[PDB]
Ligand binder design. Structure first.
Ligand SMILES: [Zn+2]
Length: 267
């Protein structure tokens, strides 16, 4: 009596920020690698937004960690943000995985990503609390429509998952479009803070739950599955954790190493 993935996979492989173990996160280089090379199921995208309102792929609110710039994304126009090197940081930080072609990798827009990988790819897209980037949900749904991904064929086939820590962001999307699959993201320590009534009211808009993997036991995974959730823990990079959680009966993981999870599905 347990819901499975919409993709027709028993275990789905969410490429966390693209192939971010091997390539600079949230770049074409990284998304190319996990989509085309490693054959991961999802392209996972974190949304920020520029000064002039463009949705972009970046994990932090600031450009500091992953570029040769400093400051918040919203303090850059798109033109200015496109001058930044979003790849050389990765060569410094992980020299065994370094590549000369990663130098001067660019921050991609959401529009560019959806264009590049097209309507047949699957996307796992993250929104914020509604007070950090007001309008971002409406912008996101509009960009999805433009790229033929809100077509309800595409939706029931798991081509779009929208994830957030924010209830209010997800509830907003559920009102504007009840067909888009929604994934509630859970903090470290937070899953245990939540009773059945809370899990029921989450369940009224989210099919998906995305806890920190270290909060998952066999007992609680089974409980969440009995409540009708698809469970996709984050971020699982080690093969021993991958196997352990798959045996709990999760439906997939967010991972920096998509090859490793797909090997565990096999082995
Ligand atoms: Zn994320």
């Amino acid at each position: 009596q347990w819901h499975t993935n919409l993709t027709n996979e028993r275990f789905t492989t969410i490429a966390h920020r693209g192939a971010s173990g091997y390539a600079p996160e949230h770049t074409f280089q990284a998304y190319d690698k996990s989509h085309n090379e490693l054959k991961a199921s999802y392209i996972e995208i974190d949304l920020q937004r520029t000064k002039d309102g463009h949705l972009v792929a970046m994990h932090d609110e600031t450009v500091n960690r992953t570029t040769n710039g400093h400051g918040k994304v919203e303090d850059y126009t798109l033109d200015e943000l496109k001058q930044l090197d979003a790849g050389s940081w990765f060569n410094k930080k992980y020299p065994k995985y370094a590549r000369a072609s990663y130098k001067n990798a660019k921050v991609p827009t959401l529009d560019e990503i959806l264009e590049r990988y097209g309507p047949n790819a699957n996307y796992y897209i993250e929104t914020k609390s509604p007070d950090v980037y007001p309008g971002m949900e409406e912008q996101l749904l509009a960009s999805l429509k433009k790229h033929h991904l809100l077509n309800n064929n595409k939706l029931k086939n798991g081509h779009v998952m929208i994830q957030s820590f924010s209830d209010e962001s997800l509830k907003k999307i559920h009102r504007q479009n009840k067909h888009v699959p929604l994934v509630k993201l859970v903090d470290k320590g937070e899953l245990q803070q939540f009773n059945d009534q809370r899990l029921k009211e989450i369940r009224s808009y989210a099919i998906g739950l995305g806890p920190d993997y270290t909060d998952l036991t066999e007992q609680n995974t089974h409980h969440l599955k009995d409540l009708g959730f698809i469970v996709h823990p984050y971020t699982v990079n080690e093969k021993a954790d991958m196997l352990r959680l798959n045996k709990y009966g999760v439906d997939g993981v967010f991972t920096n190493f998509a090859d490793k999870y797909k090997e565990v599905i096999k082995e």
